[PDB]
Each structure stands twice: as structure tokens, then as C-alpha cells.
Amino acid sequence: MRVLILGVNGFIGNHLTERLLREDHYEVYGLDIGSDAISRFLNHPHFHFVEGDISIHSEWIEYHVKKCDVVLPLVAIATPIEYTRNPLRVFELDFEENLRIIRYCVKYRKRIIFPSTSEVYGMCSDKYFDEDHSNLIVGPVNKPRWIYSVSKQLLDRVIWAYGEKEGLQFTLFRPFNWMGPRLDNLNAARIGSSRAITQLILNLVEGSPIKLIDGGKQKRCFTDIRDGIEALYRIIENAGNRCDGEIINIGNPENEASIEELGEMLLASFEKHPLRHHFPPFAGFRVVVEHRKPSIRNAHRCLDWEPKIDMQETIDETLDFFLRTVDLTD
Amino acid sequence: MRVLILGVNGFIGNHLTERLLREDHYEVYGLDIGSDAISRFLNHPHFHFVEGDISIHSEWIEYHVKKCDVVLPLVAIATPIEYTRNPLRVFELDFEENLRIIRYCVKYRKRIIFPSTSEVYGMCSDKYFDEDHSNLIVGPVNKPRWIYSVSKQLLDRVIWAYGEKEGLQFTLFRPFNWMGPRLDNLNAARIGSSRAITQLILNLVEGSPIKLIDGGKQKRCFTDIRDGIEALYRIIENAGNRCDGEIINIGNPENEASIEELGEMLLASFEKHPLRHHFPPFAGFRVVVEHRKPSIRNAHRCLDWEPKIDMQETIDETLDFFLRTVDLTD
């Protein structure tokens, strides 16, 4: 099984590649423009680094789709300010360039495992966002923050249509704030790591304040990467072909917190940490979609999966690794 | 003022071209693959027929964008069954090919007047759909009927972004069931004529039944083309530049009826018509988004416009012209 990861040089690429290389029947083709995040797999016999950029290359990516069996496109900009500061580039990369890769899979009859986004639900009023039943709610066109949500949704619909009409084999997945070791940088155009926890950990690391937009009462769910990657690994395995044509939220709905509470949890774990003294004093909380909890019935059904790691162990492990790998001279 | 109408060979093309040629300072370039719907303007000195197809041509359309001042792209498939039977083609034509035309306008700094759709609001619960304030509500990805609505919405957002970031001059308009003489054929890929009234008039003309999907209690608003085209003409005139960056619903919110009532109104006007005897007996009502009423404050503000024709005169005029131009030997 040849697995093509586009945008391997990051969080998901790292953790997914580790997982697949444990198993004896995977060849991982990791496409990216750099390899610093995964440099320890470069010498692995079943890892294959592929030089590339999905905006520049046509034929090279197309080739690698043909060569491989399953494809995971992880290249996208999901930086909120960018939705308003550089909307065209968000659209071009996240929509147009990924659409080309989708069409390569259709053409060579390959399976695609596509990262949809939890942002597709928008201001959905269900308490549990359900992939198969929840209505998707966005604001008017004069609220440009929604361009990312709606681009990703239209891409889902296009995948769905290729599936219905052209026999594309797909699974869509929606990560909810995955977190752990080897988080993407905040401005890396790679899907997967919780931007909210990376930002907060960054605040503590830099000694900048934690912004609570309107008191930080908006609630989010957070998912350990060990749980998340286990689910994604099962989607790849696709026991019984039970993931075919499915849309699967992957998150831990019991790991719910407002940004305020997430703030306090991180701070507690931080102040307790043996390396805390390398970092500045706490600059403080700064007052400047109200809920986003996944239904995980689809993951229960298709993957026989449920999350095993509590909030506190994921927080602690995520923070610990981040602090330990910070370069203190830079 | 050189006005480029892409998809001129239809309802809007006809009525818009008539209106602009009344005025002495318009040159109309009407692009299409046929001219039967507008053949009486072919000899007009200020009308210019342009052979073309927005899926086939690149450079020829690009040229005509450069040559002209304002552009109205009216080519799109808005046939509901097609959203589910041929979703990819709906996406390719309505989204991808229109996006090319948008980018030509951006590049040559031309004004674009773009037909958004009333379908963008989806299952919005406001009683009056408001371009600037109403949330847009669609179903899950497993409800593929929404691919049209969401493609059109993303196109609006992309136009909006070009406007914000690249100085594109645009106005977006949303027609609500425009109707009158020279209705598009039901399967013509040209925006503008109410598919609901064309279908019903067709039922009466053919002697097929009128389908009331779940009793036909869903309510719609209907707009005489004389009112609609007057508004569109004012958007073209753009007095005070008051339409710049605006989104404008064009409909008559007082012309509200369920499909059932629209049915009965048409039937009454039909049975009363002097040419009714050329058509079969009434095959009957057949039981097989609940409201879609526009806010028109933007049209009031920008265009100083309000609709002048009552339901009954538009119904009567629309039916009368349709019946009179039917070819009874075919």
C-alpha cells in the first residue's frame, strides 16, 4: 500500500508517517518543499521523500498519484487573519490546487482521504455537529471570514459528486483541535494542529498576553494526536470498506473548554513545568461561533473508535514537548 | 458605454438589449452560440453579435472583456434536477468558467455586473432575505441539491475579495422569479427566467399535471421583467456610483404566492384566454425552502427603485405572450 502524503513536513505528516512505518505493508511517499520536520524518516527504507509544491507542480504530482494507492492532501492555509488579509491566496491554494489533486485521483481511480474542516458547520445551532445531519450556517457575503469555510465545503461537495458520478473512492475527515508533539508553525500552510493551542503556548513561551476575544467564552473541543492519528490510521486501513463515501468528525467531545479555561489549564501546566524559568512572566489574560463540539457516531460506527486520552494528559504532553524543543538561543 | 452580455440569446439578453438600445449611448455586445431569441436586433447599428461559448473560448472572451466597459455574465445552469443528475457540469460551467470571466474583469479593470442567486440564502429563517445581514443556511454535504447554491455563494465571496483586494468594481444582483415575454427554455443554461412559472405554463400548454411537491405550500415571490429590467438598467447606469460593491436583491416581495396559489392563478388566466382551446384539458394538480421573500432595501437605496406591476398583470402578460408564440404545428 503506497500512501502519498502531500504536505508531509508537519504535524500530521510526522505522526501519520510514524504510525504507518510501524506496520510492515506501507510505503510512504511524503511530498513537500522541505524535510526538517520529518528528517528522522529520510533514511527509512519504506519512506520516500518527494520534492514538490502543489501550486507549482502539475505532472510530478499527477505521476505520484498514479504511482500510489491512497492520497492525503494536507496542504491548505487555515490561518484566520489570512481569510481576510489574503483571501484570494487562501482560495487558490485551498480550493483550486486541491481540486486538481482530487481530479488526479478520479482520473487514476485512486482513493482519497481528504481533510475537510470543522469550520464547515459554521454557526450551526446543534450541540453536536453531525456530518450527516447538521445544517451548515454561514454569514452574509460581506463577512469575508467565511471564505475558508465555504471553500472547504464546496470542495467536499465536489468530492461527493465525483464519488456519486465517477466512482471516486473517498473518505472525508474533520479534525477537531488535534494537539500533541511537533505542532505545525502557526503560518505553515499544512492542516492539522490546533491553532488555538499553538497560539496560547506561544503566548506563554514569548511572554505575550492571552487574548480572550469577548471574554473567551466560546467553547472548543481538543483531541490528542494519539487519538486522532489512530482514527486516521483506521480510515487508511478501511476495515470492511466501511469508510467508503463517509464523512468522519475526529475529535474528543468530552475535552470541551472555553478559550478562558484552556488558558487557565495551560497556565497551570506551564507554571508547574521544570523549564518554566526559561520563559518570561505571564503577560496576563487580555479581554478583546460559540460552540464546536463533534458528533463522533460516524467514527464509532466506521472505525470502532473512541478517544482514550483525557484533557489534562494531552495538555501536559503537548506543552512539555513544545517547551523541551524550543531553541533557547533563538 | 460598451456593454458585454455573455449569454445574450435569452430572456434577460432580449429585455436588457431592448432597454439599452432605447438609450443613445450604449453599444451592446451580445455573446452567444445562437441568435434566434434576439434575431430582431442583429441589424441594429448599436448591437454587435459575438459568436462564443464560455467553456470553449479563452482569448476571444478575454478580448471582448478588454474591448468593453461593463460585463454581464448570464451563462449558468440553474435546473434543479441537473444539480443532482449532472453536478460536475453545473459546477464547471457555473463556477469555474464564470470565475475565468471574473478574472478577465479584474485584469482589465472592467466593471462586472454578476447574477448571484436567491438560492444563496438557502433555508435562512429571516422572513425577508437580506443581502447584507441574513445568514446563509444549507444542508449537509450528503444533500447534493445544495451544490448550486454554494457554488454561487463562493463565487460571490471571490468577487467580494477581488473587490476588496484588487479594486474590482462590481455589483451583484439576485433576481427573484423574473417573468414576462420571451422566457428561456427550461434547459437553457442562461440565468434569469422563473423556472417555476415556465414549468407551470408548460404543464398547461402540454396538458401535463401541475406537481405540488408536498402540497405546494412553499411560498415564492414573482417579479415582472419590466420591474426587474428597470432595476438592472439602473445598476448599469450606476447613478452616483451608488451600486459599487453592493449586493442587490431584485424582486417584488408583495407578489408572494405558494406554488398552489400560483397554480390556481395561472389556471384562471389560462381558462379565460381566447387561445385556450388550442391546448389540452387541465391534467390537474398532483400532490408529490418554505419561503423566499427578498428584502429590497438595497434596491430602494441604490437604485431608488420599487416594483410597479401587480401579480395579476404580470401573470396575464407572461401567459398571454407564451401562448401566442407557441408554434401549434410543433
XYZ file of C-alpha atoms in Angstrom:
660
model
C 0.000 0.000 0.000
C 1.615 3.170 -1.256
C 0.459 6.164 0.720
C 1.004 9.612 -0.798
C 1.051 12.439 1.771
C 1.051 15.844 0.240
C 2.407 18.285 2.790
C 4.200 15.707 4.889
C 6.566 18.181 6.517
C 4.435 18.853 9.561
C 2.351 17.565 12.461
C 0.074 15.088 10.729
C 2.786 14.003 8.305
C 5.126 13.224 11.209
C 2.629 11.343 13.365
C 0.964 9.559 10.451
C 4.307 8.530 8.960
C 5.445 7.138 12.353
C 2.277 5.117 12.609
C 2.335 3.670 9.077
C 6.045 2.758 9.286
C 5.287 0.630 12.423
C 3.277 -1.577 10.084
C 5.078 -3.724 7.586
C 2.927 -3.157 4.487
C 3.106 0.624 3.941
C 5.325 2.640 1.612
C 5.024 6.310 2.490
C 5.601 8.931 -0.161
C 5.927 12.266 1.679
C 5.724 15.208 -0.653
C 6.894 18.658 0.474
C 9.264 21.598 -0.208
C 11.247 20.867 2.975
C 12.005 17.942 5.281
C 13.171 19.439 8.631
C 10.010 18.267 10.466
C 10.495 14.639 9.348
C 14.206 14.360 8.835
C 14.454 11.262 11.000
C 12.441 9.214 8.460
C 14.580 10.218 5.459
C 16.748 7.143 5.852
C 13.879 4.783 6.493
C 13.625 2.136 3.718
C 9.813 2.487 3.432
C 9.703 6.328 3.498
C 10.218 8.199 0.218
C 10.737 11.928 0.220
C 9.314 13.705 -2.778
C 10.250 17.252 -3.671
C 7.194 19.292 -4.511
C 4.737 22.132 -4.245
C 1.095 21.727 -5.230
C 0.873 25.236 -6.682
C 3.921 24.811 -8.905
C 3.856 21.195 -9.968
C 1.343 19.635 -12.372
C 2.867 16.398 -13.877
C 5.073 15.470 -10.903
C 2.114 15.327 -8.516
C -0.037 13.656 -11.148
C 2.695 10.967 -11.547
C 2.833 10.337 -7.851
C -0.938 9.973 -7.681
C -0.754 7.359 -10.395
C 2.141 5.599 -8.690
C 0.421 5.475 -5.346
C -2.783 3.828 -3.960
C -4.087 6.358 -1.461
C -3.676 10.081 -1.248
C -3.858 12.535 1.752
C -3.714 16.180 0.718
C -2.697 18.205 3.810
C -1.697 21.477 2.166
C -4.029 24.334 2.996
C -3.886 27.724 4.686
C -6.207 27.746 7.747
C -4.884 30.924 9.429
C -7.978 33.080 10.249
C -6.367 36.523 9.659
C -5.295 35.219 6.230
C -9.018 34.648 5.337
C -9.401 38.387 5.450
C -5.862 39.595 4.645
C -5.125 37.214 1.765
C -8.470 35.663 0.792
C -7.525 35.030 -2.855
C -4.435 33.041 -1.931
C -6.461 31.047 0.629
C -8.973 30.271 -2.140
C -6.366 29.457 -4.788
C -4.359 27.088 -2.623
C -7.040 25.550 -0.504
C -9.645 25.214 -3.224
C -8.159 25.348 -6.704
C -4.893 23.471 -6.199
C -6.545 20.720 -4.079
C -9.242 20.338 -6.728
C -6.509 19.410 -9.221
C -5.294 16.671 -6.895
C -8.856 15.435 -6.444
C -9.235 15.205 -10.230
C -5.944 13.236 -10.475
C -7.451 10.662 -8.059
C -10.643 10.491 -10.104
C -8.671 10.015 -13.256
C -6.357 7.270 -11.962
C -9.057 5.656 -9.769
C -7.173 6.203 -6.520
C -8.550 6.552 -3.049
C -8.517 9.943 -1.466
C -8.534 10.734 2.201
C -9.386 14.386 2.402
C -9.154 16.787 5.431
C -12.430 18.681 5.414
C -12.714 21.173 8.289
C -14.828 21.630 11.407
C -15.303 25.149 10.193
C -17.798 23.806 7.564
C -20.619 23.716 10.223
C -20.146 27.419 10.864
C -22.776 28.805 13.224
C -24.759 25.537 13.289
C -27.009 25.510 16.314
C -26.885 21.712 17.007
C -24.949 20.984 20.211
C -23.154 18.142 18.458
C -22.045 18.821 14.889
C -23.221 15.893 12.801
C -21.598 15.157 9.438
C -24.720 13.570 8.023
C -27.499 15.796 9.547
C -26.344 19.206 10.744
C -27.154 22.251 8.607
C -24.216 24.460 7.695
C -24.599 28.121 8.677
C -22.511 30.996 7.449
C -22.830 34.735 7.417
C -23.542 37.075 4.505
C -21.009 37.619 1.687
C -19.955 40.888 3.451
C -18.411 38.760 6.234
C -15.310 37.515 4.455
C -14.053 35.333 7.290
C -16.398 32.630 5.845
C -14.481 32.219 2.587
C -12.357 29.454 4.097
C -15.365 27.543 5.493
C -17.310 27.751 2.236
C -14.300 26.895 0.002
C -13.758 23.717 2.004
C -17.440 22.855 1.936
C -17.686 23.257 -1.810
C -14.650 21.009 -2.154
C -16.475 18.371 -0.046
C -19.485 18.640 -2.329
C -17.283 18.255 -5.397
C -15.657 15.167 -3.876
C -19.110 13.858 -3.065
C -20.213 14.376 -6.676
C -17.156 12.601 -8.086
C -17.992 9.783 -5.735
C -21.594 9.575 -6.899
C -20.956 10.087 -10.571
C -17.475 8.923 -11.309
C -16.865 6.143 -8.763
C -14.267 8.084 -6.750
C -13.396 6.263 -3.560
C -13.145 8.800 -0.763
C -13.283 9.374 2.896
C -13.598 12.861 4.291
C -12.314 13.654 7.751
C -12.822 16.621 10.061
C -10.261 17.121 12.793
C -11.282 18.976 15.955
C -8.201 20.712 17.556
C -5.708 17.871 17.354
C -2.710 18.504 19.537
C 0.450 16.900 20.735
C 4.180 16.920 19.981
C 5.557 18.547 16.787
C 2.835 21.138 16.226
C 2.880 22.994 12.883
C 4.156 26.521 12.946
C 1.308 28.995 13.078
C 1.826 30.176 9.474
C 2.575 26.812 7.858
C 0.074 26.003 5.124
C -0.397 22.391 6.462
C -3.613 21.101 8.022
C -3.886 19.554 11.342
C -2.624 21.210 14.521
C -4.848 23.316 16.761
C -4.060 26.889 16.046
C -5.692 27.884 19.335
C -3.338 25.812 21.476
C -0.261 26.661 19.413
C -1.058 30.381 19.867
C -1.570 30.104 23.578
C 1.568 28.044 24.138
C 3.330 30.687 22.049
C 1.995 33.439 24.299
C 3.461 31.688 27.303
C 6.738 30.955 25.541
C 7.102 34.567 24.298
C 5.603 36.278 27.323
C 2.797 37.835 25.300
C -0.783 38.084 26.629
C -3.589 35.613 26.034
C -6.345 37.317 24.051
C -9.863 36.384 25.191
C -11.996 37.667 22.289
C -15.153 38.890 24.125
C -14.100 37.117 27.355
C -13.114 33.839 25.598
C -16.439 32.166 26.403
C -16.551 30.321 23.057
C -16.187 26.574 23.637
C -13.989 24.180 21.695
C -13.075 20.528 21.832
C -9.486 19.293 21.909
C -8.114 15.992 20.767
C -4.857 14.251 21.494
C -2.938 13.382 18.369
C -2.586 9.749 19.606
C -6.386 9.501 19.426
C -6.670 11.489 16.195
C -3.917 9.611 14.374
C -5.323 6.289 15.484
C -8.606 7.231 13.831
C -6.862 8.419 10.657
C -4.819 5.237 10.573
C -8.068 3.210 10.749
C -9.514 5.273 7.873
C -6.425 4.278 5.909
C -6.891 0.587 6.879
C -10.573 0.883 5.901
C -11.653 -2.460 7.506
C -14.680 -3.852 5.596
C -14.571 -0.815 3.279
C -16.736 0.802 5.955
C -15.222 4.291 5.368
C -16.241 4.446 1.683
C -18.102 7.661 0.917
C -18.142 8.556 4.611
C -17.631 11.881 6.349
C -15.981 11.431 9.781
C -15.520 14.001 12.556
C -12.431 13.097 14.556
C -12.414 14.764 17.927
C -12.930 14.191 21.612
C -16.290 15.794 22.576
C -15.576 15.346 26.332
C -12.440 17.553 26.046
C -14.559 20.716 25.948
C -13.299 24.056 27.211
C -13.773 27.763 26.583
C -10.646 29.589 25.489
C -10.579 31.065 29.001
C -10.490 27.608 30.640
C -7.982 26.316 28.079
C -5.953 29.361 29.023
C -6.034 28.529 32.719
C -5.246 24.869 32.118
C -2.206 25.674 30.010
C -1.026 28.289 32.530
C -1.329 25.824 35.409
C 0.603 23.178 33.471
C 3.192 25.874 32.482
C 3.801 27.279 35.987
C 4.291 23.729 37.216
C 6.840 22.898 34.454
C 10.553 22.413 35.364
C 11.635 24.541 32.343
C 9.210 27.399 33.051
C 12.052 29.669 34.274
C 13.453 29.870 30.715
C 10.326 31.803 29.741
C 9.033 35.245 30.655
C 6.488 36.051 33.357
C 2.838 35.671 32.363
C 1.714 38.794 30.491
C -1.920 38.056 31.505
C -5.384 37.483 30.016
C -6.481 40.294 27.698
C -10.192 40.921 27.048
C -10.700 41.863 23.329
C -19.094 30.515 16.612
C -19.927 29.872 20.314
C -19.553 26.048 20.398
C -17.934 23.468 18.206
C -18.444 20.006 19.570
C -18.331 16.995 17.242
C -20.775 14.162 16.988
C -18.417 11.053 16.688
C -21.056 8.400 15.883
C -19.567 8.008 12.359
C -16.136 7.285 13.837
C -17.756 4.894 16.355
C -19.536 3.065 13.523
C -16.886 3.018 10.788
C -13.684 2.823 12.817
C -14.849 1.307 16.099
C -13.038 4.230 17.647
C -13.344 6.292 20.676
C -10.899 8.745 22.213
C -8.856 7.478 25.179
C -6.776 10.468 26.421
C -8.200 12.998 28.986
C -7.797 16.808 28.574
C -5.106 17.044 31.199
C -2.711 14.440 29.838
C -2.950 15.884 26.282
C -2.367 19.450 27.610
C 0.577 18.357 29.690
C 2.162 16.271 26.962
C 1.653 18.935 24.294
C 3.150 21.698 26.446
C 6.004 19.568 27.725
C 7.266 18.610 24.253
C 6.856 22.179 22.976
C 8.925 23.680 25.793
C 11.602 20.995 25.587
C 12.257 21.548 21.917
C 12.260 25.317 21.926
C 15.730 26.629 20.893
C 16.577 28.934 23.846
C 19.406 30.749 21.995
C 16.837 31.611 19.246
C -20.531 52.582 -22.902
C -19.827 49.155 -24.315
C -21.891 46.517 -22.586
C -20.801 42.889 -22.949
C -23.606 40.367 -22.345
C -22.421 36.831 -22.178
C -25.359 34.565 -22.906
C -27.441 37.175 -24.674
C -29.619 34.680 -26.517
C -32.374 34.549 -23.938
C -34.810 36.337 -21.639
C -32.540 38.815 -19.898
C -30.440 39.368 -23.010
C -33.564 40.233 -25.013
C -35.150 42.566 -22.471
C -31.871 44.171 -21.414
C -30.786 44.710 -25.019
C -34.160 46.349 -25.838
C -33.764 48.678 -22.904
C -30.156 49.718 -23.591
C -30.810 50.292 -27.316
C -33.589 52.812 -26.383
C -30.787 54.931 -24.957
C -28.382 56.612 -27.298
C -25.074 55.918 -25.531
C -24.920 52.100 -25.368
C -23.136 49.640 -27.645
C -24.305 46.134 -26.830
C -22.026 43.196 -27.467
C -24.201 40.065 -27.178
C -22.154 36.919 -26.969
C -23.759 33.517 -27.594
C -23.707 30.310 -29.699
C -27.059 31.192 -31.308
C -29.162 34.266 -32.066
C -32.772 33.040 -32.604
C -34.013 34.699 -29.373
C -32.638 38.121 -30.396
C -32.640 37.989 -34.150
C -34.515 41.267 -34.443
C -31.529 43.208 -33.023
C -28.977 41.685 -35.421
C -29.384 44.565 -37.839
C -29.378 47.241 -35.186
C -26.357 49.582 -35.594
C -25.561 49.565 -31.839
C -25.973 45.782 -31.303
C -22.994 43.524 -32.044
C -23.424 39.785 -32.148
C -20.435 37.835 -30.953
C -20.026 34.139 -31.607
C -18.952 32.318 -28.486
C -19.129 29.770 -25.721
C -17.597 30.409 -22.309
C -16.467 26.799 -21.901
C -14.676 26.689 -25.247
C -13.277 30.156 -25.720
C -10.398 31.676 -23.735
C -8.829 34.570 -25.790
C -11.988 35.605 -27.667
C -13.900 36.286 -24.450
C -10.839 37.857 -22.865
C -10.585 40.215 -25.902
C -14.185 41.228 -25.613
C -13.776 41.965 -21.916
C -10.881 44.238 -22.745
C -12.810 45.891 -25.560
C -15.845 46.541 -23.434
C -16.593 48.626 -20.272
C -19.106 46.518 -18.378
C -19.728 42.819 -18.348
C -22.890 40.735 -17.501
C -22.238 37.002 -17.383
C -25.622 35.239 -17.751
C -24.456 31.727 -18.599
C -25.209 29.212 -15.879
C -27.216 26.028 -15.425
C -29.899 26.560 -12.728
C -32.047 23.474 -13.460
C -32.614 21.723 -10.068
C -32.591 18.099 -11.358
C -29.244 18.914 -13.014
C -27.774 19.734 -9.528
C -28.185 16.083 -8.728
C -28.016 14.464 -12.190
C -25.060 16.436 -13.559
C -23.473 18.182 -10.564
C -19.955 18.322 -12.050
C -21.122 20.098 -15.188
C -23.164 22.542 -13.068
C -20.001 23.246 -11.047
C -17.691 23.515 -14.058
C -19.888 25.905 -16.004
C -21.443 27.912 -13.248
C -18.357 28.195 -11.082
C -15.155 27.542 -12.995
C -15.945 29.145 -16.350
C -17.535 32.255 -14.740
C -14.501 32.600 -12.478
C -12.351 32.987 -15.604
C -14.557 35.835 -16.789
C -14.372 37.445 -13.355
C -10.566 37.296 -13.512
C -10.612 38.906 -17.002
C -12.531 41.859 -15.475
C -10.041 42.108 -12.623
C -7.175 42.048 -15.038
C -8.522 44.686 -17.444
C -10.141 46.778 -14.667
C -13.665 46.413 -16.030
C -16.919 46.576 -14.173
C -18.804 43.391 -13.624
C -22.488 43.009 -13.032
C -22.909 39.498 -11.767
C -26.154 37.431 -11.329
C -25.845 35.865 -7.898
C -28.873 33.740 -6.963
C -31.683 33.829 -4.414
C -30.753 30.259 -3.725
C -27.676 31.537 -1.764
C -29.881 32.184 1.359
C -30.931 28.545 1.383
C -33.008 27.680 4.439
C -32.478 31.109 6.045
C -35.131 31.678 8.662
C -35.471 35.501 8.219
C -38.837 36.387 6.659
C -37.100 38.838 4.348
C -33.808 37.672 2.852
C -31.305 40.453 3.414
C -28.155 40.660 1.285
C -26.162 42.372 3.999
C -27.474 40.599 7.182
C -29.142 37.246 6.576
C -27.209 34.077 7.421
C -26.943 31.513 4.646
C -28.202 28.034 5.554
C -27.566 24.857 3.646
C -27.843 21.184 4.365
C -25.094 18.619 4.932
C -22.735 17.533 2.120
C -24.934 14.390 1.674
C -27.695 16.653 0.292
C -26.272 17.397 -3.135
C -29.038 19.747 -4.233
C -27.021 22.486 -2.410
C -24.049 22.356 -4.779
C -25.580 25.055 -6.971
C -26.341 27.383 -4.030
C -22.872 27.006 -2.526
C -21.023 27.325 -5.882
C -22.772 30.637 -6.496
C -22.094 31.830 -2.972
C -18.406 31.047 -3.186
C -18.292 32.947 -6.467
C -19.855 35.960 -4.676
C -17.198 35.730 -1.986
C -14.457 35.568 -4.607
C -15.897 38.636 -6.342
C -16.075 40.346 -2.976
C -12.408 39.544 -2.315
C -11.291 40.857 -5.708
C -13.219 43.981 -4.878
C -11.534 44.401 -1.508
C -8.057 43.434 -2.570
C -7.721 44.176 -6.225
C -10.053 47.146 -6.789
C -12.595 45.199 -8.868
C -15.689 47.266 -9.498
C -18.722 45.037 -9.095
C -22.360 44.881 -8.409
C -24.019 41.612 -7.532
C -27.687 41.084 -8.249
C -30.171 38.448 -7.117
C -33.279 38.008 -9.220
C -36.422 36.614 -7.590
C -38.607 34.779 -10.222
C -38.498 37.332 -13.014
C -41.139 36.660 -15.607
C -42.623 38.078 -18.735
C -42.419 37.623 -22.507
C -39.625 35.533 -24.113
C -38.926 33.166 -21.224
C -35.815 30.961 -21.512
C -36.395 27.357 -22.376
C -36.350 25.193 -19.283
C -32.987 23.583 -20.145
C -31.184 26.664 -21.466
C -28.054 27.404 -19.455
C -28.962 31.168 -19.207
C -29.913 32.920 -15.971
C -32.997 34.839 -15.428
C -36.468 33.427 -16.066
C -38.553 31.798 -13.347
C -38.301 28.109 -13.829
C -41.400 27.639 -11.673
C -43.652 29.700 -13.933
C -42.143 28.343 -17.146
C -42.829 24.787 -15.895
C -46.384 25.514 -14.925
C -47.192 27.316 -18.166
C -45.638 24.306 -19.892
C -47.923 21.954 -17.977
C -50.928 23.876 -19.211
C -49.594 24.098 -22.754
C -48.764 20.354 -22.884
C -51.691 19.133 -20.818
C -49.442 17.638 -18.154
C -50.259 17.876 -14.423
C -49.034 20.522 -12.009
C -46.846 18.880 -9.372
C -47.374 20.262 -5.856
C -44.330 18.878 -4.003
C -45.800 18.167 -0.515
C -48.965 20.175 -1.314
C -47.065 23.133 -2.878
C -47.221 25.191 0.323
C -43.734 26.663 -0.214
C -44.003 30.399 -0.905
C -42.180 32.347 -3.589
C -42.100 35.889 -4.870
C -42.575 36.780 -8.530
C -41.335 39.792 -10.394
C -42.355 41.284 -13.695
C -39.471 41.622 -16.097
C -40.396 45.318 -16.675
C -39.648 45.904 -12.983
C -36.613 43.612 -12.918
C -35.037 45.011 -16.077
C -35.613 48.552 -14.906
C -33.602 47.751 -11.790
C -30.839 46.063 -13.802
C -30.749 49.009 -16.173
C -30.263 51.343 -13.170
C -27.416 49.124 -11.905
C -25.832 49.602 -15.319
C -26.371 53.404 -15.132
C -24.906 53.354 -11.603
C -26.015 56.939 -10.690
C -23.565 58.395 -8.116
C -21.586 55.127 -8.200
C -24.064 54.024 -5.535
C -24.034 50.364 -6.724
C -20.272 49.905 -6.195
C -19.555 46.817 -4.114
C -23.272 46.338 -3.484
C -25.373 43.188 -3.392
C -28.948 43.852 -4.608
C -31.992 41.568 -4.412
C -34.321 42.388 -7.286
C -37.802 41.105 -6.671
C -41.304 42.123 -5.734
C -41.921 40.960 -2.120
C -45.681 41.745 -2.372
C -46.061 39.233 -5.258
C -45.959 36.293 -2.839
C -47.700 33.006 -3.547
C -47.365 29.315 -2.759
C -46.911 27.092 -5.786
C -50.519 26.008 -5.222
C -51.819 29.600 -5.468
C -49.535 30.361 -8.422
C -51.046 27.259 -9.962
C -54.596 28.493 -9.481
C -53.770 31.974 -10.736
C -52.208 30.660 -13.924
C -55.108 28.234 -14.464
C -57.667 31.016 -14.051
C -55.785 33.240 -16.501
C -55.439 30.220 -18.889
C -59.113 29.153 -18.868
C -60.057 32.754 -19.574
C -57.625 33.034 -22.544
C -59.010 33.260 -26.133
C -56.391 30.723 -27.370
C -57.010 28.202 -24.575
C -58.840 25.820 -26.964
C -55.554 25.100 -28.797
C -54.328 23.378 -25.635
C -55.368 20.194 -23.865
C -57.741 19.932 -20.909
C -56.199 20.545 -17.488
C -54.490 17.358 -16.290
C -54.895 18.543 -12.655
C -52.876 19.276 -9.505
C -50.701 16.346 -8.427
C -49.585 16.006 -4.790
C -45.938 14.716 -4.683
C -37.038 26.009 1.451
C -40.504 27.128 2.695
C -40.278 30.885 1.921
C -38.107 33.045 -0.247
C -39.049 36.669 0.060
C -36.487 39.383 -0.691
C -35.616 42.390 1.374
C -35.366 45.211 -1.328
C -33.941 47.998 0.875
C -30.648 47.860 -1.105
C -32.529 48.412 -4.366
C -34.549 51.206 -2.695
C -31.330 52.876 -1.519
C -29.013 52.372 -4.500
C -31.454 52.484 -7.405
C -34.376 54.451 -5.984
C -36.438 51.556 -7.243
C -39.573 49.876 -6.312
C -41.671 47.384 -8.248
C -44.767 48.767 -10.003
C -46.574 45.748 -11.559
C -49.135 43.659 -9.539
C -49.149 39.806 -9.575
C -52.144 39.604 -11.850
C -50.901 41.805 -14.674
C -47.500 40.011 -14.756
C -49.231 36.572 -14.764
C -51.600 37.600 -17.505
C -48.944 39.217 -19.658
C -46.495 36.339 -19.223
C -49.092 33.697 -20.109
C -50.561 35.674 -22.982
C -47.231 36.123 -24.792
C -46.253 32.492 -24.170
C -49.468 31.118 -25.668
C -49.395 33.498 -28.626
C -45.927 32.489 -29.700
C -46.294 28.760 -29.291
C -45.900 27.020 -32.704
C -49.149 24.981 -32.893
C -47.906 22.715 -35.729
C -44.910 21.806 -33.471
